[PDB]
């Protein structure tokens, strides 16, 4: 019936580290969004700017899906007008965000015993990110007056940090997989669509 490839985003074997978050465009497919907001397998499911029960009745130009992995705490920050390490240095939604933030516990996949170190987040940066900007830089962060010259040291940090997920932690420290649906409404009179 030409259904949208939602499974490809949600059920991928591996997700991207939040500093290098992955982005997929959905197009040329009929999408039933209810099969997402009626699933209780998503522990958190947040919508801004739009009414979820009216998503199948709206007209979009663009539809983006950003996937990545963070920890339970930081899901707070995937929202308009939030602060903190993730919202400031990794992934920021603008205040006029119109879309939805879906996140679910991925303890049994992304947390191994002794730590899973493949998931990194950016821990130092000289300035905050603009909304929907991603940085994948590896430049050394100068925290002191002594210049760095690209050499890591006590005052010159590597800018990224592993999570080191372990399944025994509490839920706030446990890995959560996140998908952000971003929408682009069609400009039209209301007799046409909205």
């Amino acid at each position, epitope marked *: 019936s030409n259904l949208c490839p939602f499974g490809e985003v949600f059920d991928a074997t591996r997700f991207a580290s939040v500093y290098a978050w992955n982005r997929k465009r959905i197009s040329n497919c009929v999408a039933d969004y209810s099969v997402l907001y009626n699933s209780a397998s998503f522990s958190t499911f947040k919508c801004y700017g739009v009414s979820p029960t009216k998503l199948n009745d709206l007209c979009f130009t663009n539809v983006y899906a950003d996937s990545f992995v963070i920890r339970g705490d930081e899901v707070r920050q995937i929202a308009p007008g939030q602060t903190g390490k993730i919202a400031d240095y990794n992934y920021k939604l603008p205040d006029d965000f119109t879309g939805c933030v879906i996140a679910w516990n991925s303890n049994n996949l992304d947390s191994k*015993v*002794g*730590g899973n*170190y*493949n998931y*990194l987040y950016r*821990l*130092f940066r000289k300035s905050n990110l603009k909304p929907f900007e991603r940085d994948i830089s*590896t430049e050394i962060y100068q*925290a002191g007056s*002594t210049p760095c010259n690209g050499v*890591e*040291g*006590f*005052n010159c*940090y*590597f800018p*990224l*940090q*592993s*999570y*080191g997920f*372990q399944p*025994t932690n509490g839920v706030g*420290y446990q890995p959560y997989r996140v998908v952000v649906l971003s929408f682009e409404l069609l400009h039209a009179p209301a007799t046409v669509c909205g």
Partner: nanobody, 130 residues
């Protein structure tokens, strides 16, 4: 489930020497970074020294190079910090912290900042006077 206890802090005089101890109790982390940080009254909690599980390499702040030394007995699961030629400006609360190491492009990174620690001890006073 994971605890860090500091010992050895007291009140000494300039030039004296102290040894601080940290008792490891519960580490499952395969690759980690252990460190001593210090907090002055009112100022910010800054880093003193660190040792990373990979390479077992030692890192020291500028203010303490040659005077201080960090070491570990992984057998006994303890981490020691020797402080020689103590100065009045070394007076602070000393915390034992630890965290995961960072893994990028095959290499391991052991940055020694408080923002990169997930486990903290309670601390112990060191005071240098008279």
């Amino acid at each position: 489930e994971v605890q860090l206890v500091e010992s050895g802090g007291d009140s000494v005089q300039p030039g004296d020497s102290l040894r601080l101890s940290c008792a490891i109790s519960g580490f499952t982390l395969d690759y980690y970074t252990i460190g001593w940080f210090r907090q002055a009254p009112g100022k910010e909690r800054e880093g003193v020294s660190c040792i990373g599980s990979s390479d077992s390499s030692t890192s020291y702040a500028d203010a303490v190079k040659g005077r201080f030394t960090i070491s570990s007995d992984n057998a006994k699961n303890t981490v020691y910090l020797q402080m020689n030629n103590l100065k009045p400006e070394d007076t602070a609360v000393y915390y034992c912290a630890a965290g995961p190491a960072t893994y990028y492009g095959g290499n391991w990174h052991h940055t020694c900042h408080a923002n990169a620690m997930h486990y903290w001890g309670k601390g112990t006073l060191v005071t240098v006077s008279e």
